[PDB]
Coordinates of C-alpha atoms in Angstrom, one line a residue:
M1 CA 26.1 -6.2 -17.7
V2 CA 22.6 -7.6 -17.7
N3 CA 19.2 -6.2 -18.0
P4 CA 17.3 -6.3 -14.7
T5 CA 14.4 -8.6 -14.1
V6 CA 11.4 -7.7 -11.8
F7 CA 8.4 -9.6 -10.7
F8 CA 4.8 -8.9 -9.8
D9 CA 2.7 -11.4 -7.7
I10 CA -0.9 -10.7 -8.8
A11 CA -4.0 -11.2 -6.7
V12 CA -7.7 -11.2 -7.7
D13 CA -10.1 -10.1 -5.0
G14 CA -7.1 -10.9 -2.6
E15 CA -6.7 -14.4 -3.8
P16 CA -3.3 -15.4 -5.4
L17 CA -3.3 -15.7 -9.1
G18 CA 0.4 -16.0 -10.1
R19 CA 3.6 -14.3 -10.8
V20 CA 4.6 -12.3 -13.9
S21 CA 8.2 -11.4 -14.4
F22 CA 9.6 -8.8 -16.8
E23 CA 12.9 -8.0 -18.5
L24 CA 13.6 -4.3 -18.4
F25 CA 15.5 -2.9 -21.3
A26 CA 18.0 -0.8 -19.3
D27 CA 20.4 -1.2 -22.2
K28 CA 18.1 0.9 -24.5
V29 CA 16.0 3.0 -22.0
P30 CA 18.0 3.2 -18.8
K31 CA 16.1 6.1 -17.3
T32 CA 12.7 4.6 -17.9
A33 CA 13.8 1.1 -16.9
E34 CA 15.3 2.4 -13.6
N35 CA 12.1 4.2 -12.7
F36 CA 10.1 1.0 -13.1
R37 CA 12.7 -1.1 -11.3
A38 CA 12.9 1.2 -8.3
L39 CA 9.1 1.4 -8.1
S40 CA 9.0 -2.4 -8.1
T41 CA 11.5 -2.7 -5.2
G42 CA 9.9 0.1 -3.2
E43 CA 13.4 1.4 -2.4
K44 CA 12.4 5.1 -2.5
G45 CA 9.6 4.5 0.0
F46 CA 6.8 4.3 -2.6
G47 CA 5.9 2.1 -5.6
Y48 CA 3.8 -0.6 -7.0
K49 CA 3.3 -2.9 -4.0
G50 CA -0.4 -3.0 -3.2
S51 CA -1.5 -1.0 -6.2
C52 CA -4.0 -2.2 -8.7
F53 CA -4.6 -2.7 -12.5
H54 CA -7.4 -0.2 -12.8
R55 CA -8.0 -0.5 -16.6
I56 CA -8.0 -3.7 -18.5
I57 CA -9.3 -4.0 -22.0
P58 CA -9.4 -7.5 -23.4
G59 CA -7.5 -7.9 -26.7
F60 CA -5.6 -4.7 -26.0
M61 CA -3.8 -4.2 -22.7
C62 CA -3.8 -4.2 -19.0
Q63 CA -2.9 -0.9 -17.3
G64 CA -1.7 -0.1 -13.8
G65 CA 0.8 1.8 -11.7
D66 CA -1.4 4.5 -10.3
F67 CA -0.4 3.9 -6.8
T68 CA -1.5 7.3 -5.5
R69 CA -5.1 7.7 -6.8
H70 CA -5.9 4.1 -7.9
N71 CA -7.8 5.1 -11.0
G72 CA -5.6 6.5 -13.7
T73 CA -5.4 10.1 -12.4
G74 CA -2.3 9.7 -10.2
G75 CA 1.1 8.2 -9.8
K76 CA 4.6 9.6 -9.7
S77 CA 8.0 8.7 -11.0
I78 CA 11.2 8.5 -8.9
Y79 CA 12.5 11.7 -10.4
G80 CA 10.5 14.2 -8.4
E81 CA 8.3 15.1 -11.4
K82 CA 6.9 13.5 -14.5
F83 CA 9.7 12.8 -16.9
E84 CA 10.6 12.9 -20.5
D85 CA 10.1 10.3 -23.3
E86 CA 13.6 9.0 -23.2
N87 CA 13.5 7.6 -26.7
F88 CA 11.3 5.5 -29.1
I89 CA 13.8 2.9 -30.1
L90 CA 11.7 0.0 -29.0
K91 CA 8.4 -0.8 -30.7
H92 CA 5.0 -2.2 -29.6
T93 CA 5.7 -5.7 -31.3
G94 CA 3.2 -7.9 -29.7
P95 CA 1.8 -9.5 -26.5
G96 CA 3.9 -8.9 -23.4
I97 CA 5.3 -5.5 -24.2
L98 CA 5.7 -3.2 -21.3
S99 CA 5.2 0.5 -22.1
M100 CA 4.6 3.8 -20.3
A101 CA 1.1 5.4 -20.1
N102 CA 1.1 9.1 -20.6
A103 CA -1.0 12.2 -21.1
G104 CA 1.0 13.6 -23.9
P105 CA 4.7 14.2 -24.7
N106 CA 7.1 14.1 -21.9
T107 CA 4.6 13.2 -19.1
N108 CA 5.8 9.8 -17.9
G109 CA 5.1 9.0 -14.2
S110 CA 4.5 5.6 -12.8
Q111 CA 1.6 4.4 -14.9
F112 CA 2.3 1.6 -17.4
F113 CA 0.6 -1.0 -19.5
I114 CA 1.2 -4.6 -20.6
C115 CA 0.1 -5.3 -24.1
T116 CA -1.9 -8.4 -24.9
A117 CA -1.7 -7.8 -28.7
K118 CA 0.5 -5.9 -31.1
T119 CA -0.3 -2.2 -30.6
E120 CA 1.8 -0.6 -33.3
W121 CA -0.3 2.6 -33.5
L122 CA 1.4 3.6 -30.1
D123 CA 4.9 3.5 -31.6
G124 CA 6.5 6.9 -31.2
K125 CA 3.9 7.9 -28.7
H126 CA 4.6 5.6 -25.7
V127 CA 8.0 4.6 -24.5
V128 CA 8.5 0.8 -24.6
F129 CA 10.9 -0.3 -21.9
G130 CA 10.4 -4.0 -21.1
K131 CA 8.7 -7.3 -21.9
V132 CA 7.1 -10.2 -20.0
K133 CA 9.6 -12.9 -19.5
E134 CA 7.5 -15.5 -17.6
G135 CA 3.9 -15.6 -16.7
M136 CA 2.3 -14.3 -19.8
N137 CA -0.5 -16.8 -18.9
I138 CA -1.0 -14.8 -15.8
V139 CA -1.5 -11.6 -17.8
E140 CA -4.0 -13.6 -20.0
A141 CA -5.9 -14.6 -16.9
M142 CA -6.0 -11.0 -15.6
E143 CA -7.2 -9.8 -18.9
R144 CA -10.4 -11.9 -18.6
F145 CA -11.4 -9.6 -15.7
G146 CA -11.5 -6.5 -17.9
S147 CA -14.2 -5.2 -20.1
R148 CA -14.9 -2.9 -23.1
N149 CA -14.6 0.3 -21.1
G150 CA -11.7 -1.0 -19.0
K151 CA -13.5 -1.4 -15.7
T152 CA -12.5 -4.6 -14.0
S153 CA -15.0 -7.1 -12.6
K154 CA -12.8 -8.2 -9.7
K155 CA -10.0 -6.1 -8.0
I156 CA -6.6 -7.0 -9.6
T157 CA -3.7 -6.1 -7.3
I158 CA 0.0 -6.3 -7.2
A159 CA 0.2 -8.2 -3.9
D160 CA 4.0 -8.2 -3.9
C161 CA 6.8 -7.1 -6.3
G162 CA 10.5 -6.8 -6.4
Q163 CA 13.7 -7.5 -8.3
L164 CA 14.9 -10.9 -9.2
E165 CA 18.3 -12.5 -9.5

Protein backbone atom coordinates (compact mmCIF):
# COMPACT_ATOMS: atom_id res chain seq x y z
CA MET A 1 0.00 0.00 0.00
CA VAL A 2 0.85 3.65 -0.28
CA ASN A 3 1.83 6.29 2.19
CA PRO A 4 -0.96 8.82 2.74
CA THR A 5 -0.71 12.41 1.46
CA VAL A 6 -2.30 15.35 3.26
CA PHE A 7 -2.56 19.01 2.46
CA PHE A 8 -2.74 22.31 4.25
CA ASP A 9 -4.12 25.49 2.58
CA ILE A 10 -2.32 28.34 4.35
CA ALA A 11 -3.53 31.87 4.90
CA VAL A 12 -1.76 35.01 6.08
CA ASP A 13 -3.98 37.50 7.95
CA GLY A 14 -6.87 35.59 6.31
CA GLU A 15 -5.55 36.03 2.79
CA PRO A 16 -4.73 32.86 0.81
CA LEU A 17 -1.08 32.03 0.44
CA GLY A 18 -0.96 28.54 -1.04
CA ARG A 19 -1.06 24.82 -0.51
CA VAL A 20 1.55 22.62 1.11
CA SER A 21 1.20 18.84 0.80
CA PHE A 22 3.02 16.17 2.75
CA GLU A 23 3.85 12.51 2.42
CA LEU A 24 3.33 10.75 5.79
CA PHE A 25 5.70 7.85 6.40
CA ALA A 26 3.07 5.41 7.63
CA ASP A 27 5.38 2.61 6.42
CA LYS A 28 7.92 3.57 9.17
CA VAL A 29 5.86 5.37 11.85
CA PRO A 30 2.29 4.22 11.47
CA LYS A 31 1.03 5.42 14.83
CA THR A 32 2.54 8.92 14.44
CA ALA A 33 1.48 9.21 10.76
CA GLU A 34 -2.10 8.23 11.62
CA ASN A 35 -2.40 10.86 14.30
CA PHE A 36 -1.34 13.60 11.91
CA ARG A 37 -3.55 12.23 9.10
CA ALA A 38 -6.63 12.06 11.29
CA LEU A 39 -6.05 15.55 12.73
CA SER A 40 -5.71 16.82 9.11
CA THR A 41 -9.04 15.29 8.06
CA GLY A 42 -10.83 16.28 11.24
CA GLU A 43 -12.57 12.87 11.35
CA LYS A 44 -12.42 12.62 15.15
CA GLY A 45 -14.20 15.97 15.52
CA PHE A 46 -11.05 18.02 16.19
CA GLY A 47 -7.81 18.79 14.41
CA TYR A 48 -5.77 21.26 12.51
CA LYS A 49 -8.38 23.18 10.47
CA GLY A 50 -8.38 26.79 11.56
CA SER A 51 -5.32 26.46 13.76
CA CYS A 52 -2.21 28.57 13.49
CA PHE A 53 1.58 28.35 13.12
CA HIS A 54 2.39 30.10 16.38
CA ARG A 55 6.19 29.86 16.31
CA ILE A 56 8.28 30.45 13.24
CA ILE A 57 12.06 30.89 13.33
CA PRO A 58 13.59 31.76 9.98
CA GLY A 59 16.42 29.39 8.98
CA PHE A 60 15.11 26.79 11.44
CA MET A 61 11.46 25.68 11.40
CA CYS A 62 7.82 26.54 11.42
CA GLN A 63 5.76 25.09 14.26
CA GLY A 64 2.06 24.62 14.67
CA GLY A 65 -0.62 22.14 15.67
CA ASP A 66 -1.69 23.70 18.95
CA PHE A 67 -5.33 23.78 18.07
CA THR A 68 -6.53 24.02 21.67
CA ARG A 69 -4.53 26.92 23.15
CA HIS A 70 -3.02 28.51 19.99
CA ASN A 71 0.34 29.28 21.62
CA GLY A 72 2.38 26.16 22.16
CA THR A 73 0.82 25.11 25.47
CA GLY A 74 -1.97 22.91 24.14
CA GLY A 75 -2.98 20.34 21.61
CA LYS A 76 -4.00 16.71 21.91
CA SER A 77 -3.46 13.53 19.95
CA ILE A 78 -6.19 11.22 18.71
CA TYR A 79 -5.19 8.63 21.30
CA GLY A 80 -6.90 10.14 24.38
CA GLU A 81 -3.56 11.23 25.87
CA LYS A 82 -0.11 12.28 24.79
CA PHE A 83 1.61 9.32 23.17
CA GLU A 84 4.97 7.68 22.95
CA ASP A 85 7.99 8.27 20.69
CA GLU A 86 7.20 5.48 18.29
CA ASN A 87 10.71 5.13 16.93
CA PHE A 88 13.61 7.28 15.68
CA ILE A 89 14.26 5.50 12.42
CA LEU A 90 13.86 8.65 10.33
CA LYS A 91 16.27 11.56 10.65
CA HIS A 92 16.07 15.37 10.33
CA THR A 93 17.81 15.40 6.87
CA GLY A 94 16.94 18.84 5.54
CA PRO A 95 14.27 21.33 4.55
CA GLY A 96 10.71 19.97 4.43
CA ILE A 97 10.98 17.37 7.20
CA LEU A 98 7.88 17.01 9.32
CA SER A 99 8.58 16.09 12.98
CA MET A 100 6.72 16.08 16.26
CA ALA A 101 7.16 18.78 18.89
CA ASN A 102 7.37 17.51 22.44
CA ALA A 103 8.16 18.34 26.03
CA GLY A 104 10.41 15.45 26.69
CA PRO A 105 10.32 11.67 26.09
CA ASN A 106 6.98 10.16 25.21
CA THR A 107 4.94 13.39 25.24
CA ASN A 108 3.66 13.64 21.62
CA GLY A 109 0.34 15.40 21.12
CA SER A 110 -0.68 17.36 18.07
CA GLN A 111 2.12 19.90 17.81
CA PHE A 112 4.57 19.52 14.91
CA PHE A 113 7.17 21.43 13.03
CA ILE A 114 8.33 21.73 9.41
CA CYS A 115 12.03 22.11 9.09
CA THR A 116 13.50 24.80 6.79
CA ALA A 117 17.04 23.49 7.26
CA LYS A 118 18.81 20.33 8.32
CA THR A 119 18.25 20.00 12.10
CA GLU A 120 20.32 16.96 12.93
CA TRP A 121 20.67 17.79 16.61
CA LEU A 122 16.99 16.80 17.02
CA ASP A 123 17.65 13.22 15.82
CA GLY A 124 16.64 10.77 18.51
CA LYS A 125 14.73 13.48 20.36
CA HIS A 126 11.81 14.26 17.98
CA VAL A 127 10.01 11.71 15.87
CA VAL A 128 10.22 12.36 12.12
CA PHE A 129 7.08 11.19 10.36
CA GLY A 130 6.70 12.98 7.05
CA LYS A 131 8.06 15.38 4.48
CA VAL A 132 6.80 18.16 2.23
CA LYS A 133 5.91 16.83 -1.18
CA GLU A 134 4.69 20.01 -2.92
CA GLY A 135 4.66 23.61 -1.82
CA MET A 136 7.99 23.97 -0.11
CA ASN A 137 7.89 27.46 -1.58
CA ILE A 138 4.82 28.12 0.47
CA VAL A 139 6.67 27.11 3.64
CA GLU A 140 9.49 29.47 2.58
CA ALA A 141 6.95 32.24 2.21
CA MET A 142 5.51 31.50 5.69
CA GLU A 143 8.94 31.50 7.16
CA ARG A 144 9.42 35.14 6.21
CA PHE A 145 6.71 36.09 8.75
CA GLY A 146 8.71 34.63 11.64
CA SER A 147 11.36 36.24 13.81
CA ARG A 148 14.24 35.46 16.14
CA ASN A 149 12.04 34.62 19.12
CA GLY A 150 9.45 32.86 16.99
CA LYS A 151 6.67 35.43 17.18
CA THR A 152 4.95 35.91 13.87
CA SER A 153 4.36 39.35 12.29
CA LYS A 154 1.15 38.25 10.59
CA LYS A 155 -1.27 35.48 11.67
CA ILE A 156 -0.44 32.27 9.78
CA THR A 157 -3.38 29.86 9.67
CA ILE A 158 -4.36 26.51 8.26
CA ALA A 159 -7.49 27.68 6.44
CA ASP A 160 -8.27 24.17 5.19
CA CYS A 161 -6.66 20.75 5.39
CA GLY A 162 -7.40 17.18 4.44
CA GLN A 163 -6.28 14.05 2.78
CA LEU A 164 -5.45 13.79 -0.88
CA GLU A 165 -5.80 11.09 -3.49
